[PDB]
Amino acid sequence: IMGSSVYITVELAIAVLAILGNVLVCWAVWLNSNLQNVTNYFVVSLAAADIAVGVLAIPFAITISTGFCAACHGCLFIACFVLVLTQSSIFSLLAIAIDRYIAIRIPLRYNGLVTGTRAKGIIAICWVLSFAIGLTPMLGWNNCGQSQGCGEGQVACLFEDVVPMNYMVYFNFFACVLVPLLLMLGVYLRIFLAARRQLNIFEMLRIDEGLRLKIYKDTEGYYTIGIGHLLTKSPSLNAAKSELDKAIGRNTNGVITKDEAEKLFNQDVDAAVRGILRNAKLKPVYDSLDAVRRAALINMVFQMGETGVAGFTNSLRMLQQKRWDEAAVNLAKSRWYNQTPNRAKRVITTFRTGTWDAYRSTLQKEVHAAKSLAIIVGLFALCWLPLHIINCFTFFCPDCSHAPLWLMYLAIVLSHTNSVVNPFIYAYRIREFRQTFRKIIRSHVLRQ
Ligand SMILES: Nc1nc(NCCc2ccc(O)cc2)nc2nc(-c3ccco3)nn12
Ligand SMILES: CCCCCCCCCCCCCCCCCC(=O)O
Ligand SMILES: CCCCCCCCCCCCCCCCCC(=O)O
Ligand SMILES: CCCCCCCCCCCCCCCCCC(=O)O
Ligand SMILES: CCCCCCCCCCCCCCCCCC(=O)O
Ligand SMILES: CCCCCCCCCCCCCCCCCC(=O)O
Question: Which of 46, 151, 185, 262 stands the most exposed, by the fewest C-beta atoms within 10 Å?
């Protein structure tokens, strides 16, 4: 066996899987409506880039490993085309990170901000930039436009001979790869840290009622901000903003910080507690509860009012008798539960257990999917960094012994493997993909 016949076989095998695997990803999104969200718009674009790697980039890699004589610019295309595909991938991974960001920290305006129309727009633009960036050497930044054994008008097509290293290190690596990766690292880290935030009465209603940092109109058209904090019933945004500046103690222009929204909420809680203590029915029960169960009672007052909660004569009684399970069953038979089952179910769980479980679960499911996608970026980095780092060595230490050929082509094979791993990850960690794959393979591929 030859030392190259292996290189060629291995890379042809990689190409077949790259194509088959990523065709399957696109196939699923087309068939399944539950995979036709905006997030998978970028997954498909990413899958497209990986298919193109198996079809063109890899054959180009093999062709160029011969060092054959070719025209300058024609040689640059074969060598640089893969850079186009790589850049596109970067943009796709970055857009996924951001998408998951404003979907987990700012859920209230995700669908009004992230739309299919805009996604397609951003994708189209990113493909243009990818060509502009990947084919920059073709635009003039090269080493042939000014070489023997090939005759004039031609040069031996060796990567390091035609593609400037200062381009590969400064522009390609540092600016176009390194920066996005670190940016994607910061975004995911912030997503994760948010799911591990410390829970309390503020984070409790932030989930049940939502958080707004810009003045908005409530269900009945009243100016409101923060967590359900009504400013005024006057039909004037101007007047609403003036009320806000009075409460905050500064010129807000209709926008406050998270912290400031919390101070308003704290005040709202204090008032509710005072109202509860003036009520002869609620006081005995409130006083007998622990801190967490009190928050669940305050939660109900924020929704139904103090007179409303005081109507639960029997459920309240059980609560003071610490008959948590009985109270739960009874509260479940209410018209309140029938109206808002999700919110009520969480509040009731809080009465049952006396923990923040119901609210911690919401955050841990609202992030589990982002872990799957984050793994995608980690593997990309792992598959591409080695090659980038070797370039830096060659570049920064000119008179050192160059990396041996075996190591060089090993880093190249590795980077190509990155176009195979994604489909496997979707199968293992994402349920709706796995189920669609099984359906496709069994029905359309085996045909039964
Ligand atoms: N440095 C480099 N070389 C090659 N092919 C040339 C391999 C080689 C290695 C040593 C030698 O003496 C002659 C040729 N492809 C390459 N692709 C990349 C690359 C892709 C993405 C980032 O860097 N870098 N890179
Ligand atoms: C012929 C058109 C595409 C058919 C794809 C056939 C499957 C080929 C296997 C190579 C890709 C594997 C990707 C992940 C495997 C899916 C696992 C599974 O759901 O059982
Ligand atoms: C010169 C001929 C060789 C072709 C090489 C490039 C081939 C790679 C193109 C792959 C593009 C995949 C398109 C996926 C789009 C599907 C979108 C959808 O299902 O909504
Ligand atoms: C799985 C394979 C799918 C088919 C992909 C098409 C492959 C394209 C091959 C690229 C060839 C590089 C150009 C060769 C230059 C020829 C020079 C000459 O003929 O004088
Ligand atoms: C999706 C379309 C991507 C664009 C690729 C189109 C397919 C091109 C097939 C092979 C291109 C050969 C490049 C020119 C040949 C370079 C070497 C030479 O000058 O002989
Ligand atoms: C939105 C369409 C962009 C078309 C310009 C792309 C030019 C070259 C693209 C090569 C592969 C592109 C595949 C993009 C598929 C997009 C998937 C989607 O938008 O749902």
Answer: 151
Number of separate domains in the chain:
2
Examine the fold and report which residue of 308, 327, 360 is the final residue of a domain before the chain moves on.
Answer: 360
Domain end call among 360, 380, 409: 360
The annotation places the binding site at 160, 230, 302, 315, 330, 391, 415-416
Question: What's the Cα-to-Cα distance from 441 to each of 27, 87, 169, 314, rounded to whole Å?
Answer: 11, 31, 42, 57
Could you tell me the resolution of this structure in angstroms?
2.6
Q: Is the CB of 66 under 6 A from ligand 4?
A: no
Q: Is 268 a catalytic residue?
A: no
Determine whether 209 is an active site residue. yes
Q: Degrees (nearest 5) of the Cα angle 364, 365, 370? A: 90
Domain shared by 22 and 118, yes or no: yes
Q: Is residue 189 located within the same domain as residue 261?
A: no
> Solved how?
X-ray
Same domain, 352 and 369: no
The upper half-sphere exposure of residue 164, i.e. CA atoms within 13 Å in the direction of its Cβ, equals 17
Q: Residue with structure tokens 């969200």?
A: 37
